[PDB]
């Protein structure tokens, strides 16, 4: 049981709860950003500067 164990190990003690929030936020940020940036970049394929960047540098100038 994940629910039961998530309670007793994390959510029960107020100290362990707060640490979960911090630890969970650090992981959430790292994930949510990369995901959001990915969803946005795909929705604009070939439109951004990072896409057309190869024409004017890092290969020819």
């Amino acid at each position: 049981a994940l629910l039961r164990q998530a309670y007793s190990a994390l959510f029960r003690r107020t100290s362990t709860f707060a640490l979960t929030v911090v630890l969970g936020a650090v992981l959430f940020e790292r994930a949510f950003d990369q995901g959001a940036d990915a969803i946005f970049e795909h929705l604009n394929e070939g439109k951004l500067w990072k896409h057309i960047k190869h024409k004017y540098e890092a290969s020819e100038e």
């Binding site: 949510f32 950003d33 959001a36 940036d37 969803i39 946005f40 951004l48």
Partner: protein, 48 residues
Amino acid sequence: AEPEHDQRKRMGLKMLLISALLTSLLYYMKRHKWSVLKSRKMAYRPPK
């Protein structure tokens, strides 16, 4: 006119996702706390 055009909409995406998540969670927590009152029943029993 607005060089922030790209980042503004990129933020709008992050906002809408976060806002959707947080609004839902807070709605449960509200309903959870208010469940005590929402389900509460009462009776009028005098020594009539």
